[PDB]
RNA sequence: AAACUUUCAGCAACGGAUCUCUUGGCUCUCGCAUCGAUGAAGAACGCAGCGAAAUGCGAUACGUAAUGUGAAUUG
RNA sequence: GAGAAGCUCAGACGAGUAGGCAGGCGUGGAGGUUUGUGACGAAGCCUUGGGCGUGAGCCUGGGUCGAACAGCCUCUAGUG
RNA sequence: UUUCAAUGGCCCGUCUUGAAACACGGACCAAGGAGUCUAGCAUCUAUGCGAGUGUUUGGGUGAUGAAAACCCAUCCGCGAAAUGAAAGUGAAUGCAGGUGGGAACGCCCUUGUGGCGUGCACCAUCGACCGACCCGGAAUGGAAGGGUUUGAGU
RNA sequence: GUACGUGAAAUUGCUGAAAGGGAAGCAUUGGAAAUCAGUCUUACCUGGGUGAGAUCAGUAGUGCGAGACUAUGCAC
C-alpha cells in the first residue's frame, strides 16, 4: 500500500476491432498463420504476458492503498472492522437506497473507507 | 541469448498425495515435519511412499511378512515390518506366527488373524511415536510388477509378452505369426 | 472422548457457514464465527477447533461480551460450551485489562492477547457518539 | 479399561432424564468427505427422469 | 404436502384448469368469504358469490364501498358492484371489476336451493 | 463431465487439436480394423501376431458342462473346512480324520501345489493329480474317489 | 468562413436483439382396450338474432329428450 | 499466527506453428449454504464517469426499466 | 477522452516451401452455429473391499406418499492354474534356491564418496518345478532317466 | 397510445464537439483542451485553559497455597 505503480495503464484491444464492429474489443489470442500481431513484428499491438504482471505487493490496490470489498448489507460491512487499513468497502449496485443509507452509517462508525459514497 | 540445454529441468516426483482422504493429508503432516526434523532416511522414505499412487504401492500379505523376517540369518526377529500399503491375509499359511506390523491397511482378515496369533497391528503415528527414526524396523514394500498390466508391457516380436485378446483359446492369435506352421512364429 | 481438531479443521477449511471467501485480490478468505477474535480463516484461530478459544462482540448499547470456550468436557453439550462475560460500564483502559487477565494472566489463550484487546477497542470505537457534522 | 462414552437422554419437556445410552460405535467411524461426496454425487443421480 | 396419486401439483396443469374452468366450475371459483356475523349464524366460512348479494369491499382503492353485487362475469372472474365505477372520458361511468376473494359478503341472497346450499355444507338456518 | 473435458480447452484453436495438415477426416484408412494383411500388417504383426489363418480341429456343438473340473491345489484344501473342524483336528491326534469334500466346496480335481500339515484327512473329489495324491498320502490322509 | 465527409455523445428514428414470462413442446412412468353394412375413418354441403376460420351440431341442425347444478350469457 | 493448501531465504532462466499438459475466466440448469439482493426498483440495456486483473473477465457512478436475481462449496451440460 | 506532431504499422482467415498478393472466403449487424452420446478396449489416477470381489435378473420393509433410500437368498461374471490342435496331464531338492547391483535398519570405525551384517522393490543372470515337443527306453498305464528346444506358466 | 412490456446492433435525422491538400483505422511519446480523484491536519497518545462529578493505586471481607475477573465499602 506504498509507492503503487502499474506496469502499464493501457488495455490490450483486441486486433481489428476498430475496424469491425462486430470484433469486441475483449482480448483474443491471435492464432492466424500469417498473423503480424502473434508474430510481434514492429508497430504492430502488444499481446497480454506474464511479466507485465504488477508487484505482488501493491497488486489489486487501489490508488489509496485500499482493496475495494464488495458489500451487500451491513453484515458484509462488519466484516471489516479489523481490516480498516487495508479494505475498503464497495456499495452493491443492487442495494436498495434505504439499505445503502444503513451500510454507509455502518461503515463511518467503523471507520471502513466507502469507494462509492453518494 | 545463453546456450543452456535443459533436460532434467521439471522433477519427476510428487510432492503430495493426489488422494483427498484427510486422515492420510494429516499423516503426511506428521511425516512431514519427522521428516524434516530428524536426519533419518527411513521418515524420507515414508514420506515419500505417503504420497504415491495405488500402483505404486502394492499390497503385501502375512506370509510375505512372515516369509522376510524368519529367514535363517535374519535377526529380524522381535522387529517391527513397516509398509506404506495394505497388508493382506494368505489362507494357505495355516498358522501364523506372532508379528508386528505397521501399516496403512490391514484387512478384516489379516488384523484378525495377527491379533489372535499374539501380535500387533499399528497405524503409522502409532509406528512414529515407538520408532520416531524408524530403528530396528524392517522397511518392506510389495511386488510393483506383479499386476496384470506388466504382462503386456513391452510386448513385440520375440518379447514373450502376453497380447491383449478378447478370449483365450485356438481362433484368438495363435496363428500366422505365433508357429513355424504358419509362416514364421513371433 | 474427542473427534481431532485437526480433522475437524480439515474438514471445515474450506466449506462452512461462518467463512466468507471471494475470488477478488486473488482469494481472500473471512472467518465470522463468534468465537474468532482475529476474524481469519486459520486452525489456530477458528472457535470450531480450538479447545481453548475466545471471541470479542459488540454488547448493546456500550461495551464489549468477551466469549469463552468452557472445559473440554462440555465439548458435546453446546449449551454448556460457551461462556459469556460481559464486559460493559468499564472505560478502554479498565476493559482491556480485564480482557488481558481473563485470557493472559490465565494462562488460557496468551497468543490471542493483542487481538483481543485490538478488537475490543475496535468495537469500543464503533459504539462512541457521532459527532455528525451539519 | 471402561469407556463410559455415555448420552443423556432428554424428556419431552427439555429437562434430561436419568436414562443414558452407551455411544453407538458410528459415532467413532472416520469422518470421510471425499468419500462422502464422492458417494453423494452419484447417489444423488439415481432419481433423475431421462430427457 | 399431497400425498394423493390423483392430485397434481403442475404449475401448468393447474393454471390451465383454473383458466379454462367452465362456467359451472367458474362459480365455485368465485366465492366470498362471509361476514363475522354471518359465519356465526350459518356456521358456514364462504359461499359462491351471487348476483343480489350484499358485499363490502376489503382490498383495493374501492376497500370500504358496499353494495349490491349487479352482475358476476364469469369469463373473467369479476364482480360488478352497484355504485363502484369509474369515469369515461365522455363523462359516461364505467363499472369497475372486483375479485370474489377481495370482497366479504354482509347479507346473502336467501333462496330455495341458497338454503339447500347452507344445510348441505352443514350449516344451519 | 464436460465441464472439465479438453474439448472446453479447444474452443479458440481453430483445428481442436487435429492439425492443419493432416486434418481429422472421415476414415483415411478405412472402417474397423480392414487391411491387416495389405497396409495395417506393421500393427498387427507386430502387437497381434497369430490373428490371421487357422489352427486345429473344430469342435461341433460344444457342451462346456460335462468338461467342467474347476481345480484345487494342496495348498488350498484346509482352507475348504470351517474354522472349528481346523481346531478340532489340525495339528492334534484324534481316532476320526475330518473329511474335506472338494466337489461340494465347488472343485472337480484336486492339483499338487503346495504342501499340507502332518496330520490324516480325507479328500474326497472326482479327479486327483498323481503328485497331488502322493502327498496326501504322505500326510498319512487318503484319497478316496465320487462321482 | 460555410457546405461536405468522418468519429463520438445526447435526443429522435429504423429494427426487434436482450431480459423476464409461458393454458405450448419434448421426454419418462403409471393405467386402460372401445371402429365399421345397426354404414366407420375420411370427404362435401348446410345449421346461430347479428358468425367467416376453429368448436359444436344435422332440416329436431352452436341442438331435442333425460340427469345434475342452480342464475347466468356477454361484443 | 500468518488458509502448513501457510510462512520464509536464495539462484538460474523466459522465441514459438502443428501438437501436449496445467491453472484460471465466462454461460444454462441441480444439491448445500449465505437472519444473501430486490417494487424505497430484480433482470436487462445505454453511457461523452470511477476502480481491479498480464488476460479471459469483474466491480462501481449516472441514465433507462419493471419482477425477479446473486456470492461461496459441490453436481451437471444442447456452455463461449 | 479527443486531436495534433514526430517515429513505426500492408488485410484478416486459409491451404502452402512461400500470401499484402494480380490465390480463395469475407458489404453490414443481431440471434443460431461444429469432438457429442452409447457398446467396447488401453494406460494413468481416486475410492472400497481383498484371495476374493460384484446389493439394482430378482425378492422385501410397501400401505401409508415411495422411479429414491434401505434390506435380503440362490446362481452367475471376473479373479484364485497352466499347457496342448487334441485325447490329456497339471506346478517346492533347498530358507520356495544360487549369483550381482540395491531401499531401509543395525554394528564398527574415525572423520572420507566410509568398512561389516542382514537384505524389500526392481533388473540382469545360473538352476529347480508344470504343460507341449524331441529322445533313448529297461493288450494296457507311462513311472524313473534325458534334451540343443518350446509356453501369454510355477 | 393498440405501428403498444423491455427496446441492443447494423442503419438514419437533428444538435453539439472536433478533425480534414489522392483513403481511413492502430501503436509509442508528449502538447493542447475537456474531464476525474484526493476531504487530508480524521483516529490514538500527551501537554495547555476552565469546568463539574456515583472518584484512583495498596488494601478489609465474601474456592487452602499463587494468578485474572466482577461485586459491598474504605481510600474523598
Ligand atoms: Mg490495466
Ligand atoms: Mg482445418
Ligand atoms: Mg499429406
Ligand atoms: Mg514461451
Ligand atoms: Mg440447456
Ligand atoms: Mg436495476
Ligand atoms: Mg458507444
Ligand atoms: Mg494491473
Ligand atoms: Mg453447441
Ligand atoms: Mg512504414
Ligand atoms: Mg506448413
Ligand atoms: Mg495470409
Ligand atoms: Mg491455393
Ligand atoms: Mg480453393
Ligand atoms: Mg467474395
Ligand atoms: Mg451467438
Keep these: ?118 | 541469448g545463453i546456450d543452456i540445454e535443459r533436460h532434467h529441468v521439471r522433477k519427476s516426483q510428487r510432492s503430495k498425495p493426489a488422494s483427498e482422504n484427510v486422515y492420510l493429508k494429516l499423516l503426511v503432516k506428521l511425516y512431514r515435519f519427522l521428516a524434516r526434523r530428524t536426519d533419518s532416511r527411513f521418515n524420507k522414505a515414508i514420506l515419500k511412499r505417503l504420497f504415491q499412487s495405488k500402483t505404486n504401492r502394492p499390497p503385501i500379505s502375512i506370509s510375505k511378512i512372515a516369509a522376510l523376517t524368519s529367514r535363517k540369518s535374519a535377526s529380524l526377529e522381535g522387529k517391527t515390518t513397516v509398509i506404506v500399503g495394505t497388508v493382506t491375509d494368505d489362507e494357505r499359511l495355516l498358522t501364523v506366527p506372532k508379528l508386528s506390523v505397521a501399516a496403512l491397511r490391514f484387512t478384516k482378515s489379516a488384523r484378525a488373524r495377527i491379533l489372535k496369533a499374539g501380535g500387533e497391528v499399528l497405524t503409522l503415528d502409532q509406528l512414529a511415536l515407538r520408532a520416531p527414526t524408524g530403528s530396528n524396523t524392517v522397511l518392506l514394500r510389495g511386488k510393483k510388477h506383479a499386476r496384470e498390466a506388466y504382462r503386456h508391457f513391452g510386448f513385440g516380436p520375440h518379447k514373450h509378452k502376453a497380447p491383449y485378446v478378447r478370449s483365450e483359446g485356438r481362433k484368438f492369435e495363435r496363428a500366422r505369426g505365433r508357429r513355424k506352421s504358419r509362416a514364421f512364429k513371433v | 472422548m474427542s473427534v481431532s481438531n485437526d480433522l475437524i479443521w480439515q474438514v471445515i477449511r474450506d466449506n462452512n457457514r461462518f467463512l466468507v471467501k471471494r475470488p477478488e485480490f486473488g482469494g481472500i478468505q473471512f472467518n465470522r464465527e463468534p468465537v474468532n477474535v482475529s476474524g481469519k480463516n486459520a486452525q489456530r484461530f477458528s472457535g470450531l477447533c480450538n479447545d481453548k478459544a475466545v471471541g470479542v462482540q459488540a454488547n448493546s448499547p456500550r461495551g464489549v461480551v468477551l466469549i469463552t470456550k468452557t472445559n473440554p468436557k462440555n465439548a458435546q453439550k453446546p449449551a454448556k460450551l460457551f461462556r459469556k462475560d460481559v464486559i460493559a460500564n468499564a472505560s478502554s483502559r479498565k476493559t482491556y485489562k480485564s480482557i488481558a487477565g481473563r485470557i493472559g494472566r490465565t494462562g488460557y489463550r496468551d497468543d490471542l492477547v493483542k487481538v483481543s484487546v485490538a478488537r475490543a477497542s475496535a468495537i469500543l470505537s464503533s459504539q462512541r457518539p457521532k459527532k455528525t457534522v451539519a | 479399561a471402561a469407556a463410559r462414552p455415555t448420552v443423556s437422554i432428554y424428556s419431552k419437556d427439555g429437562s434430561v432424564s436419568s436414562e443414558t445410552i452407551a455411544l453407538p460405535f458410528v459415532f467413532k467411524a472416520p469422518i470421510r468427505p471425499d468419500l462422502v461426496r464422492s458417494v453423494h454425487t452419484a447417489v444423488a443421480k439415481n432419481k433423475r427422469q431421462p430427457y | 404436502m399431497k400425498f394423493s396419486r390423483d392430485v397434481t401439483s403442475s404449475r401448468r396443469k393447474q393454471r390451465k384448469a383454473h383458466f379454462g374452468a367452465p362456467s359451472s366450475v367458474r362459480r365455485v371459483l368465485m366465492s366470498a368469504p362471509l361476514s363475522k356475523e354471518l359465519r356465526e349464524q350459518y356456521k358456514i366460512r364462504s359461499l359462491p358469490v351471487r348476483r343480489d348479494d350484499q358485499i363490502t369491499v376489503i382490498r383495493g382503492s374501492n376497500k370500504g364501498r358496499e353494495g349490491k353485487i349487479t352482475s358476476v362475469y364469469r369469463k373473467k372472474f369479476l364482480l360488478l358492484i352497484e355504485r363502484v365505477t369509474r369515469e369515461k372520458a365522455n363523462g359516461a361511468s364505467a363499472p369497475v371489476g372486483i375479485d370474489a376473494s377481495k370482497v366479504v359478503i354482509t347479507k346473502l341472497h336467501l333462496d330455495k336451493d341458497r338454503k339447500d346450499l347452507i344445510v348441505r355444507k352443514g350449516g344451519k338456518v | 463431465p464436460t465441464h472439465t473435458s479438453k474439448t472446453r480447452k479447444l474452443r479458440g484453436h481453430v483445428s481442436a487439436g487435429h492439425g492443419r495438415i493432416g486434418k481429422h477426416r472421415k476414415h483415411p484408412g478405412g472402417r474397423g480394423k480392414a487391411g491387416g494383411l495389405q497396409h495395417l500388417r506393421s500393427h498387427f504383426d507386430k502387437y497381434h501376431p497369430g490373428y490371421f489363418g487357422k489352427v486345429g480341429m473344430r469342435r461341433f456343438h460344444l457342451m462346456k458342462n460335462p468338461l467342467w473340473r474347476p481345480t484345487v491345489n494342496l495348498d488350498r484344501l484346509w482352507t475348504l473346512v470351517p474354522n472349528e473342524t481346523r481346531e478340532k483336528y489340525l495339528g492334534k491326534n484324534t481316532e476320526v480324520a475330518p473329511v474335506i469334500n472338494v466337489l461340494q466346496s465347488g472343485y472337480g480335481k484336486v492339483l499338487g501345489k503346495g504342501r499340507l500339515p502332518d496330520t490324516p484327512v480325507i479328500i474326497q473329489t472326482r479327479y486327483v493329480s498323481r503328485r497331488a495324491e502322493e502327498k496326501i498320502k504322505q500326510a498319512g490322509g487318503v484319497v478316496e474317489l465320487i462321482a
Design chain 1, 1 to 118: 500500500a506504498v509507492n503503487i505503480i502499474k506496469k502499464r495503464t493501457k488495455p490490450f484491444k483486441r486486433h481489428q476491432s476498430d475496424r469491425f464492429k462486430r470484433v469486441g474489443e475483449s482480448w483474443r489470442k491471435p492464432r492466424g498463420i500469417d498473423s503480424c500481431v502473434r508474430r510481434r513484428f514492429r508497430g504492430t499491438i502488444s499481446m497480454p504476458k506474464i511479466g507485465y504482471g504488477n508487484n505482488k505487493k501493491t497488486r489489486y490496490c487501489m490508488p489509496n492503498g485500499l482493496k475495494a470489498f464488495l458489500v451487500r448489507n451491513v453484515s458484509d460491512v462488519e466484516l471489516l472492522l479489523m481490516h480498516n487499513k487495508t479494505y475498503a468497502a464497495e456499495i452493491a449496485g443492487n442495494v436498495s437506497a434505504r439499505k445503502r443509507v444503513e451500510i454507509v452509517e455502518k461503515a463511518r462508525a467503523l471507520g471502513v473507507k466507502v469507494t462509492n459514497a453518494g
